[PDB]
Amino acid sequence: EDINFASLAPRHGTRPFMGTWNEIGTSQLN
Amino acid sequence: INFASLAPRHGTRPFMGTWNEIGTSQLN
Amino acid sequence: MSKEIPTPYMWSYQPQMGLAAGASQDYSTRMNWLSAGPSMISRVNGVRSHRNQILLEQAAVTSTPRAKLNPRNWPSTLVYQEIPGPTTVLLPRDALAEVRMTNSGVQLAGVSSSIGLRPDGRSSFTPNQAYLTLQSSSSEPRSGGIGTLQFVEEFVPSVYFNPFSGSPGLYPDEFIPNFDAVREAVDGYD
Amino acid sequence: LNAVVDLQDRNTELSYQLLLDSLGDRTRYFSMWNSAVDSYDPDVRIIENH
Amino acid sequence: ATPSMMPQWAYMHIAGQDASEYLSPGLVQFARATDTYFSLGNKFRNPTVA
Amino acid sequence: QTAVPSVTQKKFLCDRVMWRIPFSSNFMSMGALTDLGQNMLYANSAHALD
């Protein structure tokens, strides 16, 4: 078999409720 | 030549020579 | 008017932004023939002009053909991209088996981007294992600027013949350390 | 054509000082070249006060 | 090595071909014979390249 | 018997010697012309120094 595994993503209804792009690591005292 | 390419070149040819595989010395 | 045997323009690196910063003829490797006769002077000129030839050939052989020396940004195609092999993972547990055993009363101890390849640590109560194949490369190719190893290939010293001969809009302005090619004007608060 | 080219930076006196040591030991006094190596006392610099 | 700098290296013997090898065959044969009394070894440079 | 407490300070002297930092990858002396001062990276471009 070569099935592909996605991610579980706690569900708000039928939709898995993935989320937005928040991979932000900028603090920058300035 | 791959092993011989690791030696310093004194001019053009490498510096290999004078096989000095030793380690016999003891008290005697 | 120029010597037909000019000193090459060495090109210098700004490792931080990863792109080159200027040039200036090599004033470090010059010989001092000012106390030699007409023949040694010629042999020195010959050594000098052999260098120039080697530099041109090297450039053809290695440097990427460009319409603009020292581009402000390199396309993803032309930048060396590190492409590691796919990363395989051997999943330790069995998802269903441990659920069945735990519900029994047994108390255990001790987009599509994936591949669930079965190999038919381990556990006695089930013979099912599962490989997982993952892509380990970047999501998108990096364009940016060039690194150290690629720099020494792209920017060989450039022999400059008859250097500044008319058409001030044709001079190589990349040789200026503080030239901003995008706006095409030397900048700097200094 | 002067064959001797002297720069402001190269140090021939220091270079010839190290060269003599590499050729042979300078512990021996040569009167002709007046080559007596300047040597401090081995134990007056570090007072080994027993 | 750097193929561009080799012409300057070789011509000035910074990194060349072992002076026993670039002198004319007459000289090296000559200097070998008369090395006992009139030595020419330290006149010529034989480079060492790491 | 009377041995008032003390603190120890160490030191060293090094005369007639110049500190040396060879420009080589492994700090050895595999040749007069170093291997690092022969690479294309240093012999085909200009680098500052601080």
When computed from its CA atoms, the radius of gyration of chain E, rounded to whole angstroms, is: 13
Supply angle C-alpha A17, A23, A24, rounded to 5. 135
Q: How far apart are CA D47 and CA D36, in angstroms?
A: 25
Name beta bridge partners: F32: none
B 1-28 residues with CB below 8 A of F? 8-9
Contact across the interface for F46 and C156, Cβ inside 8 Å? no
C172: buried, middle or exposed (CB in 10 Å: 19+, 13-18, 0-12)?
middle
Distances from the Cα of D12 to the Cα of C29, D6, D19, angstroms? 22, 9, 10
C-alpha atoms less than 13 angstroms from C-alpha of E23 in its C-beta half-sphere: 17
Chains within contact range of chain E (3+ C-beta pairs < 8 Å): B, C, F
Contact across the interface for F30 and B8, Cβ inside 8 Å? yes
The single residue listed with the structure tokens 């190589």 is C172
What single-letter amino acid sits at C168? P
Q: Between chain E and chain A, are at least 3 CB pairs below 8 A?
A: no
Name beta bridge partners: D30: D35
Residue A30, number of CB atoms within 10 A of its CB: 3
Query: Could you tell me the resolution of this structure in angstroms?
Result: 3.4
Which segments of chain C are extended strands (E)?
Answer: 9-14, 19-25, 87-91, 130-134, 179-180, 185-186
With beta carbons under 8 A apart, name residues in chain F contacting E19: none
- Residue in C29, C156, C157 closest to E8 by CB: C29
Contact across the interface for B9 and F31, Cβ inside 8 Å? yes
Chains within contact range of chain C (3+ C-beta pairs < 8 Å): A, D, E, F
Contact across the interface for F45 and C26, Cβ inside 8 Å? no
F50 in contact with D at a CB cutoff of 8 Å?
A: no
When computed from its CA atoms, the radius of gyration of chain C, rounded to whole angstroms, is: 30
How many helical (H) and strand (E) elements, i.e. helices and strands, does chain C have? 3, 6
Q: How far apart are CA C51 and CA C163, in angstroms?
A: 18
Q: Which residues, 6+ apart, have CB-to-CB distance to A23 below 8 Å?
A: none
With beta carbons under 8 A apart, name residues in chain F contacting D15: none
Q: How far apart are CA D33 and CA D49, in angstroms?
A: 37
Nearest to residue C47, comparing CAs of C61, C31, C58? C31
Name beta bridge partners: C89: C132
Q: Which residues, 6+ apart, have CB-to-CB distance to C33 below 8 Å?
A: C40, C41, C44
Coil vs helix vs strand at B27: coil
Contact across the interface for D2 and C35, Cβ inside 8 Å? yes
Q: Are C64 and C154 in contact (CB under 8 A)?
A: yes
Coil vs helix vs strand at C132: strand
When computed from its CA atoms, the radius of gyration of chain A, rounded to whole angstroms, is: 16
Q: How far apart are CA D22 and CA A6, in angstroms?
A: 73
Which of C88, C93, C115, C131 is the mutation pick for testing A, counting most A CBs within 10 A?
A: C115
Name beta bridge partners: C123: C126
Q: Are A4 and C113 in contact (CB under 8 A)?
A: yes
Nearest to residue C132, comparing CAs of C101, C168, C93? C93
Distance from CA of B22 to the nearest CA of E (A): 26
Supply angle C-alpha C142, C145, C149, rounded to 5. 100
Q: How far apart are CA A9 and CA A17, in angstroms?
A: 6
CA C41 to chain centre: 40
C-alpha atoms less than 13 angstroms from C-alpha of C176 in its C-beta half-sphere: 12
Sign of CA dihedral C145, C147, C153, C159: positive
What single-letter amino acid sits at C73? N
